[model samples]
Target: SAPTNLEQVLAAGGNTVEMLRNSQIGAYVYPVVAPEFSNWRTEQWAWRNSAVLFDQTHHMVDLYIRGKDALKLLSDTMINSPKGWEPNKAKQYVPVTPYGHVIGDGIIFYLAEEEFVYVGRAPAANWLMYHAQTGGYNVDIVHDDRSPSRPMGKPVQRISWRFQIQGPKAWDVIEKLHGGTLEKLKFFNMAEMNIAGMKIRTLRHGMAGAPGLEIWGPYETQEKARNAILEAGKEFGLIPVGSRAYPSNTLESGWIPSPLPAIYTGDKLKAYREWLPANSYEASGAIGGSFVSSNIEDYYVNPYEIGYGPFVKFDHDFIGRDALEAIDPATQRKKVTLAWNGDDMAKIYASLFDTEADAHYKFFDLPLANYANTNADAVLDAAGNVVGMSMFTGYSYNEKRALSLATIDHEIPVGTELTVLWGEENGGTRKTTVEPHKQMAVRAVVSPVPYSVTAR
Candidate 1:
């Protein structure tokens, strides 16, 4: 009989992670379900030109913490200081290991006094759950479990629904849909309103960095709210973005959507990992590319590497504070954008039809190309020395360039051309989803982050 649950799936294979990959158990359901609304390229183009809507209700997990000590509990677990934390404010929250390594990060919302909501990928949520269970904090944490593992084609969420609207002309469409002037709505601020007879709260947040808002409310009225916005946005060139074009935004926005958390190998986090189920991405997601290291710490990235330095504050004590303070800014890595050679990319695809045994490894998918869970490819300097590691790889239809988000030594000058060693040198893995391919040195040039100038 087929495996009924995650435990059975793992029990059936010795190397269960490989088994999950073979079965298409991705870290997020978006990639597996609707790879795109239409196709990724056009969808990606819409975000920069007209308008785009994202049904973000499924892919993320939601955490609700309530109690008088809820704020204190978050303050100690998260790397961010809670100085500005208050009702209606939203910010990216991150948790780190004591050694100054990131476990995970997500968007945290202060809903009200003694009530807070967090939504993001699962790694950090699992970590917080572990702490909340073991620590002697006076708080109640309720989890609405949903993710890649969550059952598809259904309401995975327990209560709320989130809809993201963004694009160049989004402000016009949004103001019209909102039924009033929102000129005074500030960034990261939230306001309550009723849309299509469903009450919702609108957040001045966006993925394209274009003028837009993220509206969310009760799951019961999800359809009414979504339809209302879509109907009102029709005249403004708004198109609903599916799973396909959604992932590409990370490249333009300079966000490392998936990073191998620092929680896997440390002795202190061993208990946490044991607490996690075998099917969790932290336990099963494969990490491949040219940046492998003997020590797991080598794979760990600090806030500086991921470009969250601006959000990190030393005013209050936190888990990784001592280690973070000891680090010298002069030695930290610089986050930058990498523009891949267009001609090289074309050749990679053409090689697919080559007759030779080693024509090319495999065709690299565009707009959103990621074979491994965390694609950490080696970035070679002019002299072919490893100077950095490339994380997120994708293409910007609007920019007409294939790009990657990378972290390299600050010493390397911008505009310095480098070679990204694409794909695993050893060839393909047993995972059937990814095509077998040999390694190739992809020529890339360093560029400013927010790779899309319009994004800034």
Candidate 2:
């Protein structure tokens, strides 16, 4: 029998051997680790000038919901409204508790006015189905686990890959392969087009802190697409990248993942009190770690603390509307950036080589399976009290630092000294002073969505 889990996948390739041995999620091979390049930084550079491929073969559950009540069902449950979405448009939505805690977040791809494709961090089909069933909306719900027409799975072992080509040179690479004017593509938009006679679905979205595109198709077709782009991108310096590089890029661009908001529960709404699930509660596709689940009473986070206060429009009647509206914005969790001292990192790496005593490798327990689908659990302090935890900390090579995507109490303020606990309970702690990075760190002054947008 083939390898069952991530361990086997890591053993197959020497390149990912270290990552697999150290990764909390282990290694589940999906096509290429660094398809064309060895390191993440190189791949990032390639993304800026050309295109790179990412393997996303992990199980993705698809929810097929239709009917006049379909939109209403989602609108009532989701944090954002899908009312203005047009056909082929993809909108990002958050599911929050009555008190404004984020339950989960995902993208809603409007295939048609009546049809939608909801993709999330893990297997959320069951959650969506359960919600629809309880909501009693006049809609039909189907889990496309084994749709023959659009068969995503096969007995012969199938693999799925997603490639992201970003930056100003993105269209040049695509035009070389497909021969179309990609300039017409707008943000959060998608178009079904052909590249070298192969049908591929391309979406206009970038997690790489630049203008980008996400292309999805079958493995065989993707292989061809990969080769075609590589051949065409030689002049543009296109490099194949892996998922490892994305965390840093996302941090630079300032995008935090879910579950961070659950840490604050001081002033939640009555409806949110019941709707939100408790800590230690496991959702499908949630990777195990110290941050996986904890006591709900210990859980506390508000919108303002996580760099999402501006987006929390009080004009609507969402779950956490009242509680969030009444709170002072300055009192929310302040998102900030911190850089790990290089000497400290070097010391940590050198400690592994010590011949005296146990020199076991130290691994960071990732709360999520992959950076694309998961977020980090941040540990914060306020006047010596445990104030908050951050969810996403993307590693950026350009900045030569490990930046956290955190949400902390306002009292902590910028430049307030604090420590981010990395290991498990009774485990080791890495100490760093709280300071602000333009994107990920909590800002004293409120700004727009992307804290760092380059004006063209």
Candidate 3:
């Protein structure tokens, strides 16, 4: 049978980099508008040395859920405990399938008895909507989707903004702007604060592994709030973080984000598969690196593998509780930081310039340049046995070396030296974002996640 998927369509259509370069991320993050404001490399180091503000107005989608059955509906769908989750408390909401593979995850804020907002990735947002509609619960779900193309291929009116103020001195900026110490606002807590006479919801959240706040409010008053925050933090060496430096903040925060939603299997989620588009984000998702297996489930990872072990609870009946409990923690892969050999990385880059046919390897980019949306590098042992898969790899300015978040078997000690097979096996796939080249290996050493040097 002929292949039918996003990549296949791209190959059939021929050349897709133009589409990727014009997409929302390409426009904002990678930038069709080059040199928009400040350089990305400068903004990249701002959070570590001073402070930076990330404009999150259009990148993420929002889902609003309200109704008495909301809490129960959420609890039954995710691995997190809902007992202590209340107003002012936030959770890294993770939902899995019946077999414990990530359907996706998002940031859920408890607003009231039956009111909450999930702000983050699109996959998790849609997954929640699916369950809300099919679960027959007394809940009203509203989605505020972020689209590269607007209504009727035109656009939509009304502008709303979300800003993330982060750095070592981020709290100082908040205090100066709000005219008080937010020290009382504990981690993962949200509060309505008056800023320039507008009520804004401020969450004590920082994805850069630093102290900061996430502030959101009306689109009309966005200018006032943004200007005020900037002016107040001027003395703190605060700089605006461009799109280039934004998404990579997860690099320091130790968040792996979400993998491809594992809803493609089993009769239980067959309805979800039917509900999803044929070439939806999860459907046409790409798998890379050295972990090659015909079975798709082999790529799926449980919560424990991603350092969410503390969040799982057996007391409550969740979707994947049975299968999730079946996996022994001792035998499963443990999340760790992979320190790639700098010389080895240099050699991979060196191959690109060589005219010798056998000297070349797949091309790579520095500092969070992931070609595929879902990226995983193969982690191998000296014996050439697959041990783990690494994701979210990039150069950490703070670390001064290339690093990746990987989950390895417990037997692979923290100090173990492992070889990571970089790039796709068959040179690359049809996605024009991927260039033709050869599959190759890079030297790496595994270490504890957050790598002991993550400040705060």
Candidate 4:
């Protein structure tokens, strides 16, 4: 018999790591949107050379929280300081376990006094909902789950339509749409702008180091806003990015979008596991790559390890404060981009034509190669010692290089060479996206995060 909740599911499966590694769930999908508008390469190129419109409404969960205890609920749960946080500003809300392992992160918009909305992946939203309901916090929450991964032909709807105008010419397109020089507020600062005669809310956002804004309005007005932007952006060469190229944008921006949500184990989080349904993201999500570990904790990382170190301030008391306090940030692993060797990437693609070979190297999907909900490819140093974990894997058309985001030993030099073990152990996992193939020790250089010279 199948289990009803995460706790029961874990009890039914003796090995947590094995269950997820072989999960039947396919790739983590960005639903609804077309896989490619023109092509992933040109779409990827637009965000660097011209501008791109990223349709962000479908794939992320949103939680609207309200009440006097709204701020308290956030401050108590996140690693961020809520001291000076107020409406019209957004914080990258990061929550960790009581053990100090990062549970998840998202952009939480403080809409107004006693009102806020959290937008991101499911882990952080689930955590907030749990504490809000059972933690005695006097707050109300409205959960809007992400659209169905495989809707087929079913109609889908989200409360708000989210879009980002980004690239080198993003500002030009934006100013044209506004019909004037709209002020570029600081990052995450919120303001209102006119789009096609309708006032829309925007958050200052920059992608690949280019200035832009994330705008959102009611779902009903989505078409109106989208049509107006596309029309105004014609001269500036703004193209609407598809689902395929959308996820890869983070590669240049240096954001490790999917962290394994660090809540699978810990007696302190047992209640949470029980609260999470068997169909929840944490319970059913797949883990793909060559990083094999019997202990699930080995896959977990702290906020400091993944470029969120600066966001972990001790100014506020939160769930993981004590655990974070006991440790020093200097000793923690550092995040960097792994620039895959060109010749090696060529060999990987070239192997597809070699029919005489016993097996081909793992298929490196162009533009974006990540095939699971959470990716954990083992990054090894000389002598085959594991020095880091590559969390996000992809290729950048603009840079013409394969890249991955990883957290390596703090002492490793930026130019140090490392090898990322590609493909799952024992041929491959049962994941639908994986094929039976041999692993490849692809060589890579430890490049700085944001991997682009323009971005740097």
lDDT, candidate 3, 1-456, per-residue tens: 453543344435333333222222211132211222477677878888898887877666788899988998889888998876778898989998888778778889898889988887678887888889888989998888764422344544324578888888887888887778667467889887767777788888765456788888767787798888888889999988765667666766778864756665577876776566545665454544555665556777888888888888887888989998997877778888888888998888888888867647766665675766566678999999888888777777677777888888878767778888887666665565666777778888877766644211
lDDT of each: 0.75, 0.51, 0.73, 0.92
Clashes of 1: 3
TM values, all candidates: 0.90, 0.69, 0.88, 0.98
Q: lDDT winner among the candidates?
A: 4
lDDT of 4 by residue, 50-144 (tens): 99999999999999999989999999998988888879999999999999998888999999999999999999999999999999999999999
Q: Count residue pairs with overlapping backbones in model 2.
A: 21
Residue 15 local lDDT, model 2: 33
Off by over 4 Å in 1: 1-28, 31-33, 147-158, 207-209, 452-456
Give model 1's TM-score versus the native structure. Answer: 0.90
In model 4, which runs have C-alpha deviations exceeding 4 angstroms? 453-456
In candidate 1 the C-alpha lDDT for residue 288 amounts to 56
Q: What are the clash counts of all predictions, listed in order?
A: 3, 21, 0, 0
User: How do these models rank on TM-score, best leading?
Assistant: 4, 1, 3, 2
Tens digits of per-residue lDDT, candidate 2, 1-456, equal 554333343234343312211233323212224323567677666555455554443334456678888777767766565546578777666656665566655667777777876664432343466567766788887654412212334533334455667665666777777766665477779886567788778788764455667777666675687787778777666665664664345566666654533422344232222342432112112221224243443344555665555556544566667666678876566775544444544554465467783432234312112221233444545444555565554345555554555565656544444555443332321111111111111212222233332121
Please state every model's RMSD to the true fold in angstroms: 3.9, 9.8, 4.9, 1.6
